[PDB]
Ligand binder design. Structure first.
Ligand SMILES: O=P(O)(O)OC[C@H]1O[C@H](OP(=O)(O)OP(=O)(O)O)[C@H](O)[C@@H]1O
Ligand SMILES: [Mg+2]
Ligand SMILES: [Mg+2]
Lengths: 347, 340
């Protein structure tokens, strides 16, 4: 007999939920059956209790059940995502989005989950829109984008319409909660690999556990400067997910010859400014922004490689860095973006 | 100040800065807080164990918005008798007994809501929803008054709706005893959680109230007769924690299933029974808790001594029942409501 008093009482008593209770709660939320007060109580109570991977996996599972799927047999088994929680409070250029373009241009299929800004000046979806990319495509056309261009963009609101009730509560309360983890865990194309940024150092291991449960090949990353990306200003903590297990690592870009950057060198502006930064990087502009893009693209390619049990960490990184740099240098990334824009205008 | 700031601080398991709880409660009380924000705050403040300063700020804001009683209508030595819940039967009866002994009582509550159970008083025929002027008249003429929370705290309705929707106890469950709009300086205040009882005692200490904050060691939000109780004795701005055993005053041990309150109609029947002289564990616990309230009343003077105060309180409580004064006071309270 599941109910809000039972579930919220258990959480406020600092107890983990019984199997299925988080799922019940999320389903009530997704079906419009939860009062805003109940949604907010649930999100906050779970956050302060400390969510488990089982619980977060249940929430993401329910979201994915209610999402619009892509058509059968349209997502390659090795497709990758590059996406983060956001909420790092830094307002950088759109590193995941730029990395995603480069990854696809290197020949790794990318189905990117994304959304507009929550607290920053310009989100991934905002910047793509400013570049002339269509962010408004449904399942069939995203599938066609992936096949024809090598990248698809799943705009979260378009694929998760039933999340509107939760999204409203999240905006109202402002404080980050367990809900802030869900975007990266609920790509509707269900790619099995990705580079997944987490702004909240204390919740990254839980995100990794969710991916581990799905047997995804993922690097969950938190820059030690607070970025929900692999950073160039310092080390990053990586929760490496492979073969159903999570391994905690610290990553230093200096190990691959990257010079240290300052965080203000990665600072972003409005959608137009960040669109300009994308163009500059894909056009061959050298500097800190390119370095961060290449590093993150490489990370995603490493995750992709980890779909094979044969993959080795250092060779994977060297290969990833080589491929990412080459995809920019040959013009492949610049061309792929142009083709992506042309594709959307030809619909 | 902001919701992101305050909620973020709480989710980080940090005590709030001076004034932040007050800001939040003020937003809630002015109708400026969305239900999601009300709920987030209530939950966060509960899970980040609230401090006396914080609870005091919440209660303060609430009282700053409340309708007061008219000037000089609340006696300086008026008392409250109430529990936070987890015993409306016990506190209702004890209140009548205390008033019948000649200690002015002013209660505050809602229908089972800043202190549920006013349904029992209604089941007995008492008009619970009176404005400030008439509560004042009731106090003077009958010796007891009841401040109906929706009437005196109309701005709380937004919070009240949220509490019902989430349906789990929160920090707001502590506010009833701390937001009596008559602002009695004394009382017997029950609390079902030991840790939170101490917090409530700190709030009362800050107001220089003379109160006994009581928690049965069996979990009851009243002085129990099934075992010992913890009392936080508040007087002179300081708190003394005590273990109390009513066996010392000759009270037999009862079982918990004999004392627990039921619904309004059941509660009402029990009131009539006890006020009419029915002996047993329920009477004992009423007498004990009535005596506690009288002891708190006595503590408004610096020259009150613990055991002699208890012995007087118990004699006064017993006599108020046994003479029929308690029964008659209830009848006069019912008559009052009809005579208006
Ligand atoms: O407004 P914030 O809460 O700070 O979030 C900024 C962006 O980061 C996340 O996406 P993603 O990793 O796809 O975008 P990126 O290209 O900016 O890294 C999120 O969906 C936002 O678009
Ligand atoms: Mg990102
Ligand atoms: Mg980012």
């Amino acid at each position: 007999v599941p109910s809000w008093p039972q579930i919220l009482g258990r959480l406020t008593d600092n107890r983990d939920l019984a199997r299925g209770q988080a799922a019940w709660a999320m389903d009530q939320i997704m079906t419009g059956n939860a009062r805003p007060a109940q949604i907010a109580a649930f999100a906050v109570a779970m956050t302060m209790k400390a969510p488990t991977a089982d619980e977060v996996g249940e929430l993401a599972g329910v979201m994915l059940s209610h999402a619009h799927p892509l058509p059968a047999d349209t997502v390659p088994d090795d497709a990758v995502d590059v996406v983060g929680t956001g909420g790092d409070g830094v307002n950088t250029v759109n590193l995941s989005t730029m990395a995603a373009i480069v990854v696809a241009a290197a020949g790794v299929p990318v189905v990117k989950h994304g959304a507009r800004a929550a607290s920053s000046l310009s989100g991934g979806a905002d910047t793509l829109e400013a570049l002339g990319v269509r962010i408004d495509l449904g399942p069939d056309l995203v599938a066609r984008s992936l096949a024809e261009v090598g990248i698809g963009f799943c705009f979260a609101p378009r694929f998760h319409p039933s999340y509107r009730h939760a999204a409203a509560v999240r905006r109202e309360i402002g404080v980050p909660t367990v809900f802030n983890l869900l975007g990266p865990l609920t790509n509707p194309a269900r790619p099995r690999a990705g580079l997944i940024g987490c702004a909240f150092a204390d919740l990254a291991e839980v995100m990794a556990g969710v991916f581990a449960a799905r047997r995804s090949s993922v690097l969950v990353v938190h820059g030690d400067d607070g970025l929900d990306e692999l950073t160039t200003t310092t080390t990053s903590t990586i929760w490496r997910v492979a073969a159903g297990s999570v391994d905690k690592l610290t990553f230093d870009p200096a190990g691959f010859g990257f010079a240290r950057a300052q965080l203000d060198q990665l600072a972003g502006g409005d959608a137009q400014a960040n669109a300009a930064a994308v163009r500059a990087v894909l056009g061959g502009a050298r500097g800190p922004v390119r370095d961060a893009v290449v590093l993150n693209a490489a990370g995603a390619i490493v995750a992709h490689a980890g779909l094979s049990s044969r993959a080795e960490w250092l060779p994977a990184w060297e290969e990833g860095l080589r491929r990412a740099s080459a995809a920019i240098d040959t013009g492949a990334a610049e061309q792929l973006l142009a083709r992506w824009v042309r594709f959307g205008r030809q619909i």
